[PDB]
Design a protein around this ligand. Sequence first.
Ligand SMILES: Cc1ccccc1-n1c(=O)c2c(C)c(C(=O)C3=C(O)CCCC3=O)ccc2n(C)c1=O
Ligand SMILES: Cc1ccccc1-n1c(=O)c2c(C)c(C(=O)C3=C(O)CCCC3=O)ccc2n(C)c1=O
Ligand SMILES: [Co+2]
Ligand SMILES: [Co+2]
Lengths: 380, 385
Amino acid sequence: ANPRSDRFQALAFHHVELWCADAASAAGRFAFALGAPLAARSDLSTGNSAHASLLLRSASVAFLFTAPYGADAATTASIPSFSPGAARRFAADHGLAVHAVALRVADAADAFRASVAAGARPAFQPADLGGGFGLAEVELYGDVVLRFVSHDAPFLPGFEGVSNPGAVDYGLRRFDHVVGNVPELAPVAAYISGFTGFHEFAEESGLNSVVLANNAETVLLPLNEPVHGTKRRSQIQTYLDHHGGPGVQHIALASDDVLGTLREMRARSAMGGFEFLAPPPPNYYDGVRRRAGDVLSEEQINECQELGVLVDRDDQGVLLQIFTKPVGDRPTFFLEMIQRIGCMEKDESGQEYQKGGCGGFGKGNFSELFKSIEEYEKSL
Amino acid sequence: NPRSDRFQALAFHHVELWCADAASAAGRFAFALGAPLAARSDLSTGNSAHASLLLRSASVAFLFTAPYGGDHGVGAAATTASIPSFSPGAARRFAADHGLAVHAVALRVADAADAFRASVAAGARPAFQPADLGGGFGLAEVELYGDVVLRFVSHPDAPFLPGFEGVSNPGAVDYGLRRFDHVVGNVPELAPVAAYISGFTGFHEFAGTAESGLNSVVLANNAETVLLPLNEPVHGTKRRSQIQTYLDHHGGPGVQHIALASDDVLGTLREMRARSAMGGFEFLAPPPPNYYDGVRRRAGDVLSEEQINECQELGVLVDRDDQGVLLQIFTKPVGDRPTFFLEMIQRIGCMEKDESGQEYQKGGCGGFGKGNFSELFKSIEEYEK
Ligand SMILES: Cc1ccccc1-n1c(=O)c2c(C)c(C(=O)C3=C(O)CCCC3=O)ccc2n(C)c1=O
Ligand SMILES: Cc1ccccc1-n1c(=O)c2c(C)c(C(=O)C3=C(O)CCCC3=O)ccc2n(C)c1=O
Ligand SMILES: [Co+2]
Ligand SMILES: [Co+2]
């Protein structure tokens, strides 16, 4: 029973801005690793002297990589919410980490001011990019910012489109959820739920969890916090140790055939692509046949077996998922490849949709994987 | 050749690029250059000081190194760094100033302590006093042009470097890169640094005047294995020099490009250009067709019909020395700044069974493509008709 209490029309994820020291290398690696070609650029090739921005896109998922180069007349920046000192500061503290999570908004001025009184500390007050585009940014958590942008039409003013025949598309379709790790969960969760109006979500390894979501449950913002005192310390705390503060832990990418796409992503893992986490032991998939065998026939399960895809269930669907290694240098930011199978409905006027968060987020895999690891460790 | 080297400049060992994200730069280079990950030294190896990845393609060894966010004091003998010359502050100031640019050019020497001593005794500025990394490995570092370092490495032999866990990725393919041909620097002013370098390294000089170019001089060791060309801009020369705009965007002197030798530059380029769409290395716009009809009248006696034809599809430049032909192609700048770029070449000929009887290959066989500054100039004007 979501309240639909969102204080601004948050439609969907617009773009995710990463900040590095060389936006060509990171975007270059993410291009073949994810299978999303270069779609837009704001560099010296476009008259931009302040920063080099490049955008990979695979349908609706749009990664943005922004690095700096300038002076006073460097008003040529496409993004006005950009600072060279902050960009170099960010690249030294966290390596390749997410700086902005941009959402689509009815109007840039409203959602900012709807949050400026709801408790959001401002980061970039609204600005008119010209011709229907407006940009706004609030602080969210840590140094990553929540960005508001409103509207064929280009990505942003100052971005020229990129054409390529390679058309390297690995079937990736949409951003699903953007998870962030913070020291204490309660204050930042009340802060984000307070200034957005977003609600919680209904559907130990060492993580205390909470998931924010909009009315349509399409803009998912899960939050994380560690649990101290464990013999082996939580992966959230070691993140906060190596990230140097709170940040975006991972980002989920939704596909409609994540098996065939993983076959393409793993093909590039040997040549500089995304090396994936070690596949679960064989007896883990003996479980998924008992758990999800009614939804997944063997051939669909066996495609998950070699590729190492994980399987977790809620009542209204099953969630295929697989995690990458830390894509950057430090054990910090990584990527989650998922596909959700279940919970359809033609309730929205007859236009069908899938209720967001279908299948959960794989929280049950902490239990079934650790047990299958111990069950396999005994058999050797 | 004078044979006046103060130390045994055996060969290129590696080129170290200092960046703020080694995993991304090494990952993109491995895909674009076809050099699989052959070694790594980071947190997974016990190295809490820096993350380092070694990209390897035969002898081509690119080393990408990025610091971690930690800040250990000067009091903290018991360090965990694989490369002891690495400092966290100089790596961040290097990434903030120059972006993605190489920081060290490593020459394999007979002995590191002796290479350092012979260098500093001839006026070399010390960068890192000699050490013994363990086993038989020895390290030494002296400056050449700016923040770039002429690192000395000494294994008389074992991995790439001690503390580096070798990586063997099954299915890892290779395009055909074999050798570092030359590492070129772009220096404020040529005469001082060329006299400075040649002084402490004992290198000698090495040898079509063009209008849209620069000034240059190439240094080389005894066997001409390692080539250290140096560039200087021309001022008051109308169009913006492609060397000064480097110094303006790079923030001082640095390494302009690196030539990578190949047995089959054609087959290697055909695989590299297949990656340019998916985040690979974008190459310069191909020369107009008048160029490749002109290379037939200049190098038709030395290249087959099919060989000249395939240089045209892949956009490879052709130049001729009296001794051999040089097929070369250049990438668009690999970083965000039009700074560091890469050069893919193959040299043809210039081999003799000197001394023992091995085939050998004369260094600089074909030159460095000096005749293409002029040849490409006319081809644009002829095409702009
Ligand atoms: C624990 C661990 C160590 C080394 C590498 C990987 C892991 N690791 C995960 O990171 C992991 C994650 C990150 C999720 C996950 O996506 C998730 C959400 O999206 C938000 C709610 C909290 C949460 O955990 C689910 C299962 C996971 N599992 C099962 C796992 O093993
Ligand atoms: C200058 C320039 C601007 C925009 C795109 C392309 C170019 N460009 C080059 O960069 C270029 C280079 C860099 C070399 C080259 O490698 C070389 C050496 O390695 C050592 C001595 C200096 C030198 O010329 C040769 C020919 C070149 N040619 C023909 C060319 O057009
Ligand atoms: Co998730
Ligand atoms: Co060259």
